[PDB]
């Protein structure tokens, strides 16, 4: 990717998206990030979509295999679950590496800072899903810390109905419920987020209305599930 011009890497990421070639898309976006310029909103979307598709596939596979493994409890399912797990951890590490080496430090504005810290929280969370023992504790703490920093910035700098702020709060609530065994905090966060977002929805730009209303629906749906 080093040899290709940034504009070409972005163009190819877009082509890969159209072709549903998400591994390629992610690699192109990694190359683009490594050029050392900030990403635009569009480009952050490309980066996010690419890596989430890759890890999403791996997570789904891991869940299938882990279920078979648990139901079973020869060596094959354990071995193959471990293989997929290692690949998943590799992708998460790549993303966390990009965030640490390039994206978090180089972000100027609050929106992009919060987005990248949310992403850091998310990929530590995906690591936490497969972790055991003492490693798991450290990983969970890393996720929590990233999410909390993002929350702190978003509350100071961004409107309650901002889609990044909402997506972050939704994901942090999922972290509380599914990872941190904190249902009370998950529900309280989701309900507070929903109410405060609805209270300011009349100020939200039309450009964000579809995305913010979707996230608020997901908060509602999680709240129904959790209560």
């Amino acid at each position: 990717m080093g040899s290709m011009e940034r504009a070409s890497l972005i163009q190819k990421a877009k082509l890969a998206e159209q072709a549903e070639r998400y591994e390629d898309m992610a690699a192109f976006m990694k190359g683009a990030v490594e050029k050392g310029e900030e990403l635009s909103c569009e480009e952050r979307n490309l980066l996010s979509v690419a890596y989430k598709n890759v890890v999403g596939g791996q997570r789904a596979a891991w869940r299938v295999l882990s279920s078979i493994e648990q139901k079973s409890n020869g060596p094959e399912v354990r071995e193959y679950r471990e293989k997929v797990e290692t690949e998943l951890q590799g992708v998460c590490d790549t993303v966390l590496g990009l965030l640490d080496s390039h994206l978090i430090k180089e972000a100027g504005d609050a929106e992009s800072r919060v987005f990248y810290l949310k992403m850091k929280g998310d990929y530590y969370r995906y690591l936490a899903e497969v972790a055991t023992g003492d490693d798991k504790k450290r990983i969970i703490d890393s996720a929590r810390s990233a999410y909390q920093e993002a929350m702190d910035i978003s509350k100071k700098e961004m409107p309650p109905t901002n889609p990044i702020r909402l997506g972050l709060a939704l994901n942090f609530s999922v972290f509380h419920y599914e990872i941190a065994n904190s249902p009370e905090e998950a529900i309280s966060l989701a309900k507070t987020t929903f109410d405060e977002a609805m209270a300011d929805l009349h100020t939200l730009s039309e450009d964000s209305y579809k995305d913010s209303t979707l996230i608020m629906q997901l908060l509602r749906d999680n709240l129904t599930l959790w209560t």
């Binding site: 939704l170 609530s173 999922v174 995305d211 979707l214 997901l218 999680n222 599930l225």
Partner: peptide, 10 residues
């Protein structure tokens, strides 16, 4: 049923 996180969509 798993909790729903931010969807992988524009």
């Amino acid at each position: 049923q798993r909790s729903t996180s931010t969807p992988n969509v524009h």
